[PDB]
């Protein structure tokens, strides 16, 4: 029935403004208030405010006050939340949900996809892939991989042997570097006897920068 | 609303999550489950009322100003970040959410980390940065300590770590400690090692490389 549609992740420049949208697929946006919850990737859910359809009244928390504006296109019933004067702290995922203030539910039942908003403080950069040599032993669990470094912003996708190599592949979560760029390391466990015979190639693709690098790791 | 940060449990037992309040009839408290990478889902409403389609293993209780969510028959699929929420009886009727509780099903096995050290790639050394990567693979749980020892000297503040859960195939963990040094400082030293201490390997395991 009622499902909420949100746009995709949007990286923004410090000091700009983003207007995350919320569409009612099957809903009418004319009875139950639509609450907006802000969540950093690892955070506790944090209610920002609510917009109520019957009376065109918007309620916003004092902490979020002054920047949040609850606009809404009445035609097609699409509500928009615009967080103005963006700052680094603002980086979080923003969810729109149908609040059942009236009625027995007394909770937010239908949630939205969630539009991730990040404040860049950095320019897009292609990834620099560096090989992780699998030591030098002919045996046995041998570890090799690729170091994707200095790329902005996510996502980057790393595969091994063009998707053939799956087991043992451990792509590690991206870590924001002190410079402001992202970096990840992907490792794979292989038999050390195959080090010389087998050809191991990591396929890294940074679609934001449209950089597809096929680095090879066979020391 | 405040919740315990994490609640660990063995498979089959019953864990409970507290939701202590500093208000809406103290019957509006509800319980939410947010699995990693997914939207929050209403699991329990009206203290104990269970929305249709939710497993019977979830119940709700209310003591004083503390709301409790009890999960019977804890399974590895039950683990998620659980949040309690209720209205705050304020001017704009704030809906306050809880801090969050990471339920974890964790028992019956122990694994030792497979330590592998990777010297910095000379290509990256050309760029000017030296990334020494220490890899801990297939260990459980993640209470492991990694000490960067450069020429028998501990290095701190220059190490960044990342952890991943290996599905359920091994239900273990993987860590990548990255020691980043400048090309000059890297060449200034000789021996680079990462001593690793974990529950699986009580005796300290160190992987060293000399350049």
């Amino acid at each position: 029935q009622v499902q909420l549609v949100q746009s995709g992740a949007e990286v923004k420049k410090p000091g700009s403004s983003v207007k995350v949208p919320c569409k009612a697929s099957g809903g009418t946006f004319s009875t139950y208030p639509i609450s907006w919850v802000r969540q950093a990737p690892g955070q506790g859910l944090e209610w920002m405010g609510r917009i109520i359809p019957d009376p065109p009244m918007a309620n916003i928390a004092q902490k979020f006050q002054g920047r949040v504006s609850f606009s809404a296109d009445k035609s097609t019933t699409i509500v928009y939340m615009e967080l103005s004067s963006l700052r680094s702290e603002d980086t979080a995922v923003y969810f729109c949900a149908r609040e059942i203030l009236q009625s027995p539910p007394f909770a937010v039942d239908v949630w939205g996809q969630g539009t991730m908003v990040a404040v860049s403080s950095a320019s897009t950069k292609g990834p620099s892939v560096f090989p992780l040599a699998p030591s030098s032993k002919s045996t046995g669990t041998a570890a090799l991989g690729c170091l994707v470094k200095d790329y902005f912003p996510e996502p980057v996708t790393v595969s091994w042997n063009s998707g053939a190599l799956t087991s043992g592949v451990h792509t590690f979560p991206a870590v924001l570097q002190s410079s402001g760029l992202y970096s990840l390391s992907s490792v794979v466990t292989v038999p050390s006897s195959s080090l010389g015979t087998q050809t191991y190639i990591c396929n890294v693709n940074h679609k934001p920068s449209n950089t597809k690098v096929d680095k090879k790791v066979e020391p | 609303l405040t919740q315990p940060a994490s609640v660990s449990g063995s498979p089959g037992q019953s864990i409970t999550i507290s939701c202590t309040g500093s208000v809406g009839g103290y019957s509006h408290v509800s319980w939410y489950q947010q699995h990693p990478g997914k939207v929050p889902k209403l699991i329990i409403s009206e203290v104990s009322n269970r929305p249709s389609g939710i497993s019977n293993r979830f119940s709700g209780s209310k003591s004083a100003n503390t709301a409790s969510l009890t999960i019977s028959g804890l399974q590895p699929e039950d683990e998620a970040d659980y949040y309690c929420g209720s209205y705050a009886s304020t001017n704009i009727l704030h809906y306050v959410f809880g801090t969050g509780t990471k339920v974890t099903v964790l028992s019956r096995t122990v694994a030792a980390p497979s330590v592998f050290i990777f010297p910095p790639s000379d290509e990256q050394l050309k760029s000017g940065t030296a990334s020494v990567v220490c890899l801990l693979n297939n260990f459980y749980p993640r209470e492991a300590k990694v000490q960067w020892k450069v020429d028998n000297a501990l290095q701190s503040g220059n190490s960044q770590e990342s952890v991943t859960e290996q599905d359920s195939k091994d239900s273990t963990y993987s860590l990548s400690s990255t020691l980043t040094l400048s090309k000059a400082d890297y060449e200034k030293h000789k021996v680079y090692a990462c001593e690793v201490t974990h529950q699986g390997l009580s005796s300290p395991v160190t992987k060293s490389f000399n350049r």
Binding site: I52, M57, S103 | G24, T90, N91, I92
Partner: peptide, 27 residues
């Protein structure tokens, strides 16, 4: 439409909710 912030809750949208009547206003 550009909704406005009023820092109160109307009792028109408040049904079966008691917290509303604890804190509600009107024009």
């Amino acid at each position: 439409f550009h909704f406005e912030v009023f820092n109160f809750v109307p009792c028109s949208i408040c049904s079966n909710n008691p917290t509303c009547w604890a804190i509600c206003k009107r024009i």
